[PDB]
Design a protein around this ligand. Structure first.
Ligand SMILES: Nc1ncnc2c1ncn2[C@@H]1O[C@H](COP(=O)(O)OP(=O)(O)OP(=O)(O)O)[C@@H](O)[C@H]1O
Ligand SMILES: Nc1ncnc2c1ncn2[C@@H]1O[C@H](COP(=O)(O)OP(=O)(O)OP(=O)(O)O)[C@@H](O)[C@H]1O
Ligand SMILES: Nc1ncnc2c1ncn2[C@@H]1O[C@H](COP(=O)(O)OP(=O)(O)OP(=O)(O)O)[C@@H](O)[C@H]1O
Ligand SMILES: Nc1ncnc2c1ncn2[C@@H]1O[C@H](COP(=O)(O)OP(=O)(O)OP(=O)(O)O)[C@@H](O)[C@H]1O
Ligand SMILES: Nc1ncnc2c1ncn2[C@@H]1O[C@H](COP(=O)(O)OP(=O)(O)OP(=O)(O)O)[C@@H](O)[C@H]1O
Ligand SMILES: Nc1ncnc2c1ncn2[C@@H]1O[C@H](COP(=O)(O)OP(=O)(O)OP(=O)(O)O)[C@@H](O)[C@H]1O
Ligand SMILES: [Mg+2]
Ligand SMILES: [Mg+2]
Ligand SMILES: [Mg+2]
Ligand SMILES: [Mg+2]
Ligand SMILES: [Mg+2]
Ligand SMILES: [Mg+2]
Lengths: 455, 456, 455
């Protein structure tokens, strides 16, 4: 069994089942601006911070000073690490470098090594023979070195001369796929010789913290803000549960989200509202029109509002922003208004994967999550059957328009409630000031799931 | 930290989170006629017309005079800036250029540099890297923010010509001119920025007389839509800072509402703009007058402005830039787009969504009331409002549907929704006469009136 | 501001916002038989005919005589232009040609120059240096020269060595895209250094007139041929208006087109009928069966019939044929039977673009246009909602079958009428000799928009 060295890169320790094979070199190929350099530095930096192991960085293009300046954007003082003798930047911008690098290892007792764009150290029949020799010389030193190669295509040759993969024992591919004029940073482990790992691409983002690779069940009940909804839900929602508010435009998804967010602040509980449709300006006015002062809850430091457009950033970023905000603010409950706004111009695979990330994080932090969804057919019940994100929600609140005698009346019903009794009736509710009012159901009307009930 | 220098290019300053890394070489690769030269010029020009910094431009193909003449289309007098010593066009049409460029550094405290078509300086990969790496160093030591312009053959292939001008550069900017079904779409993206952060993915930009134009409250004041009943159904009227939507089948009366909405503005001595994409200026004046509203009168009062043209004519990138530019000058109190459906014909849903967001943002960020009309692609109408991905951004939805009543095609209107306001939740039947919309009562006897064919 | 020289090529003067940059060379790349030669000649010819400016043509492959023979197919006597000293064919089938061409310019005082397949003058590192030198020598002469390059792919390298685009100040691409075994001639302006222009491809055709690049509102009312329809329309159709007759096969679209065309000839007005379904033979018989002598109106020189198959020619050609016919005959009104026949096996983008061309030309000539369309679902009302060409028509006449007591009765209704009152009732009409008869509506029948009304 080959031992692995923790890279201390959030995620990579789980995808590589521990980390990188010890005493063996790892290839980190990718297109320009994928994060081949950031990874290589972050690996060494983390090593000379956690495990307190010496790390020698071999540069081939940019100067040893520019690397420290660029790395200063993540708050990593590389000069202090070089001043303490915990890092050695070998300015090399092939046996010469081998002995020069070999000496530097024992000269500083280095445990981790990182080569910067080994592609430039050959500016295919010769690359193999050279790369093979460098892979061997580092194997004899027993130093976990990380190799950086370049690629032209995102779905073509792994390396440049398409031979730097068979020469390496481990292969990590960094991708920046462009889909619908939106860049998506993906990291995958192509191979790991001697050990196991997770296969397929994995959504990652680069922030001020560096690379962010992103690979209970109590009977405690919380209030949704509506006494009738709490009665219909059989004593309100569960604490560590995901609720879903589906319905056609203008049904009252935001109203419910608002009331659900207010109820938290009422019990002095912190709450976050992620808006992707309306603006805080419009949100404050609309909310106030339902006898609810959102500015008040923002002044009590209980409610936090963060609105932004869905086509603005990527799903990978959107998720990172949610987690980050939740980590700082540490809310009791959160609300996403809405999921249907984040799925527009996105692949169903990347949306599903995104939705799994928020619900997983909300459920694994005992946070109540109210996710709103706009129906794409009038019959909202038929929109729930297609919705492949209804198999992840525990509670489903369905809002549907009902054509009643040449009038557009509304209707609410607890479509489902996991491990809890709920009212299985389509109750008619109106909207006014200081919020809504759930009345009775249309017992004398048939096919009320169509949006045009019959007498 | 890496300090960014403002380029004063509308959009790029926000997309690159400040601008271009200070004392670093930025690559700007792109196909022929993408706006590489224009960018490199606009960067320097803005540098000597804002932060008063002497910029040294380098040429490898076209003459220094042609560049001065070519930039005369945007209204930039390079000759005056050259004579003033606030610009140096070094004519170059290996280490020699470095020395001359290195000499031009302290020659006049040169802060901004710009090299054009560097590709031609190695058109007679292994050698291209060694040379490209050298320039990056000589300029890096000079401590001057230079802009490198490379050329590319494929719009979605190699970044540069030898696919090595990106790994040698600290920053990479890609200029695109993709052909979206016999329609060119200019896009700008920041591939990377060694040091700082930036916005990811391609960003719709347009070129005009101003140059490159990269295109990345909530009061309870109510305004009239032209109809008293419609104002009463909206619980007083439309919100000033709100986006209204008129959806319905062809010949429902979307343009009628748009006209009455634009009239009401001019009635209160308010300025209005009508963006027509279906009917002609002359056609709009005849139909309007047939309802009892003189449009020519409103054009003579300098209150209402009519600007109609075909949707297949220009692209969404341009169409939006026109609305913005025409709004900036005229400064309307309220505008109307008739219609959005006419602008979504032979257009990617992704590029259409981005358009509506860009237009609804501007109307909302300028306290302008916007009535956007949309022709429903189904008889149900309400079913079309469900597909409508633009109905989530809309605040008020005015639905217009037909109703087969006793072998007669009668019209019906209803306020589908009204954000942070009460509205009449009834399907009121209305008729059109020689004076405008006449809203009557709803159909209490009839059932399934959302279908388009009810029953008692 | 760079001044532009009018090429006098129908369309190019509007797409290039005036014409080609004066004193600068323009590239006209394209595949074999795109019209690179025709353009180059037509540019010079027009110059030594309108502006009366000398023009020197530099040939590199075919002889100076063959060019005159080929150009004789458009009725351009190049020998007469050479005999008058207004054209000089420099048989060149690189500094040698420069001086030879430079002399010829001042030797004839030429204002426009055209090089024939500059690609053959290099039969990539060398092409640039050569092309750059030729681009400069012509710039010093201050002569608006037009360069012709070749390409292998229609959506690949702009030129052959993919470097003749960055060397040129202006780039015009000629395309002959093959889509569904149908060739579509498209012209686009890739770039114009120093000035503005129209972007994207533009449908053009080659005829006997050469390249044909194809980039009011009175209350006057005309009769449709039916007194009931005129009453239902509120005093007949408008003069400068586009009417639409939609309905399922065998509803009476042709009957209406015929009657509408007859009414013109009745008031001694010229009319054109563009048939794409039935033949003039079948049209004359079917028409005569409705008490209408089409041969009579053809003998009075009032009605003109021109039938042909939709898959025969391209939309670009079909439009050119319509315009040409209208220009000669100068009709008062025209009818297209039908649009649904011209949209079969065509892209919706090219159909839309085609439909915009006919309606624009008909509306900009005070000509009444009756365009018929066959519905693709039984519910014709639902076929009008999909129809993205219903937002361009001012009047819509909908014909729908109605299942009435085990009988297939017909029904007509004025679906819409811009700036005019119309009868908003589904009137039942039968068909017989000397034409149709509109009766009353089915007031005791419900869901008559389905095609199966209920009692
Ligand atoms: N003061 C009010 N009195 C009565 N009804 C109101 C009032 N304010 C809003 N409404 C009703 O509630 C609706 C707004 O509810 P909300 O904004 O939550 O809808 P939604 O279904 O979330 O819409 P979206 O499609 O934007 O997500 C209005 O369209 C209207 O029907
Ligand atoms: N402070 C920061 N916050 C967020 N993202 C950042 C930050 N600094 C850099 N980035 C992102 O990371 C990228 C830097 O990655 P890196 O320098 O490792 O590139 P690379 O993959 O090695 O490419 P190349 O080898 O071609 O230079 C930037 O282009 C940017 O997208
Ligand atoms: N003078 C009039 N008297 C009565 N009804 C009229 C009059 N003028 C127009 N109409 C009616 O109004 C319709 C025109 O409305 P409008 O031009 O707003 O259409 P729309 O709903 O915008 O649809 P589209 O843009 O597809 O034509 C006519 O089709 C007719 O039904
Ligand atoms: N009299 C005519 N009427 C209509 N079309 C014509 C006529 N004469 C020529 N054409 C069309 O124009 C073409 C001639 O174009 P031209 O000779 O300019 O080709 P080209 O694009 O220069 O190609 P190449 O350089 O490969 O010869 C013919 O192939 C035909 O399609
Ligand atoms: N006044 C103007 N108005 C609008 N567009 C203009 C104007 N002037 C130039 N353009 C546009 O910019 C293009 C020229 O831009 P520029 O010269 O920067 O091209 P480029 O990307 O550097 O190409 P290349 O390097 O191949 O010459 C023209 O083809 C045109 O599309
Ligand atoms: N002499 C006649 N008497 C009665 N009905 C007739 C007579 N001639 C034709 N018809 C009716 O009219 C129809 C022909 O009308 P027309 O050719 O205009 O139909 P259309 O809807 O235009 O068909 P297409 O699908 O070919 O476009 C026949 O199918 C029949 O129902
Ligand atoms: Mg790097
Ligand atoms: Mg909402
Ligand atoms: Mg250029
Ligand atoms: Mg309209
Ligand atoms: Mg030819
Ligand atoms: Mg027919």
């Amino acid at each position: 069994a080959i031992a692995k060295m923790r890279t201390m890169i959030e995620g990579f320790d789980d995808i590589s089942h521990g980390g990188l094979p010890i005493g063996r070199s790892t290839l980190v190929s990718g297109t320009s601006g994928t994060g081949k350099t950031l990874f290589s530095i972050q690996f060494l930096y983390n090593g000379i911070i956690e495990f307190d192991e010496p790390g020698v960085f071999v540069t081939f293009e940019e100067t040893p000073q520019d690397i420290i300046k660029n790395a200063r954007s993540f708050g990593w003082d590389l000069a202090k690490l070089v001043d303490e003798g915990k890092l050695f930047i070998l300015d090399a911008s092939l046996s010469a470098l081998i002995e020069r690098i070999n000496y530097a290892i024992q000269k500083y007792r280095a445990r981790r090594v990182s080569i910067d764009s080994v592609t430039s150290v050959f500016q295919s029949s010769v690359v193999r023979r050279e790369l093979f020799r460098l892979v061997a010389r580092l194997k004899q030193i027993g130093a976990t070195t990380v190799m950086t190669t370049e690629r032209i295509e995102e779905y073509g040759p792994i390396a440049r001369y398409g031979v730097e993969e068979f020469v390496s024992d481990n292969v990590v591919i960094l991708r920046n796929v462009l889909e619908g004029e939106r860049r998506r940073r993906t990291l995958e482990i192509l191979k790991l010789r001697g050990t196991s790992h997770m296969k397929g691409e994995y959504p990652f983002t680069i922030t001020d913290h560096g690379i962010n690779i992103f690979p209970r069940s109590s009977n405690v009940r919380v209030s949704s803000g509506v006494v009738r909804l709490d009665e219909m839900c059989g004593g309100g929602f569960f604490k560590d549960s995901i609720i879903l508010a589906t319905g056609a435009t203008g049904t009252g998804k935001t109203l419910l989200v608002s009331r659900f967010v207010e109820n938290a602040c009422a019990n002095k509980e912190r709450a976050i509202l992620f808006a992707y449709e309306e603006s805080r300006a419009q949100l404050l006015r609309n909310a106030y029109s339902w006898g609810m002062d959102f500015e008040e809850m923002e002044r009590q430091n209980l409610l936090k509002i963060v609105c932004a457009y869905p086509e603005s950033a990527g799903l990978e970023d959107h998720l990172q922003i949610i987690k980050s905000e939740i980590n700082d603010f540490k809310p009791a409950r959160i609300a996403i208004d809405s999921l249907s706004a984040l799925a527009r111009g996105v692949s169903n695979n990347a949306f599903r994967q995104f939705v799994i990330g928020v619900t997983g994080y909300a459920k694994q932090e005992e946070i109540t999550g109210l996710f709103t969804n706009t129906s794409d057919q009038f019959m909202g019940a038929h929109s729930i059957t297609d919705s492949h994100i209804s198999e992840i929600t525990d509670t489903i609140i369905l809002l549907q328009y009902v054509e009643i005698r040449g009038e557009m009346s509304r209707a609410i019903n607890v479509f489902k409630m996991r491990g809890s009794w709920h009212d299985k009736a389509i109750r008619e509710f109106m909207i006014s000031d200081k919020g809504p009012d759930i009345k009775d159901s249309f017992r004398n009307f048939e096919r009320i799931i169509s949006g045009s009930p019959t007498r």
